[PDB]
Amino acid sequence: GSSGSSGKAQKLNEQHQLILSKLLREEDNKYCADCEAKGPRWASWNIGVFICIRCAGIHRNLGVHISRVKSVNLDQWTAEQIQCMQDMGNTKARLLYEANLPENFRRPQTDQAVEFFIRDKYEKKKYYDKNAIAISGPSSG
Numbered sequence: 093g094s095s096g097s098s099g100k101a102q103k104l105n106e107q108h109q110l111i112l113s114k115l116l117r118e119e120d121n122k123y124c125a126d127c128e129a130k131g132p133r134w135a136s137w138n139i140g141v142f143i144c145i146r147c148a149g150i151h152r153n154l155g156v157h158i159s160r161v162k163s164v165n166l167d168q169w170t171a172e173q174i175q176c177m178q179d180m181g182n183t184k185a186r187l188l189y190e191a192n193l194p195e196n197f198r199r200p201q202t203d204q205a206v207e208f209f210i211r212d213k214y215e216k217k218k219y220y221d222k223n224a225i226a227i228s229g230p231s232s233g
């Protein structure tokens with residue numbers, strides 16, 4: 093029996109640190125966006141998805157230009173990055189990155205693979221669906 097009666101965001105206004113948690117709570121962000129681990133603490137804002145500690149390490153390798161890894165709380169954040177977390181989040185991330193995946197796709201369990209999978213997945217953008225972002229048009233600001 094889930095009584096509920098929990099959700100007074102109103103009071104928690106202008107509170108990012110919290111918002112971040114609200115997302116993870118969602119089943120969509122309840123597991124890593126790669127290894128689908130249990131309890132994805134760390135999170136990659138540059139991309140807009142929550143990842144575990146193990147994977148996080150790989151992201152760093154990619155480069156501060158490809159993906160920036162940082163702590164969800166232990167580290168500081170900014171509205172600019174916050175909005176992104178939601179704008180993208182794991183939801184879209186799947187409909188984007190996990191869009192060009194094979195019918196019998198299966199997340200890697202061993203690091204030896206994960207490291208690459210994520211790399212060739214994001215770095216190489218192998219399973220990257222560009223069609224989605226087909227609204228590219230830089231105009232006067």
Ligand SMILES: [Zn+2]
Pocket residue numbers: 124125126127128129143144145146147148
């Ligand atoms: Zn992971």
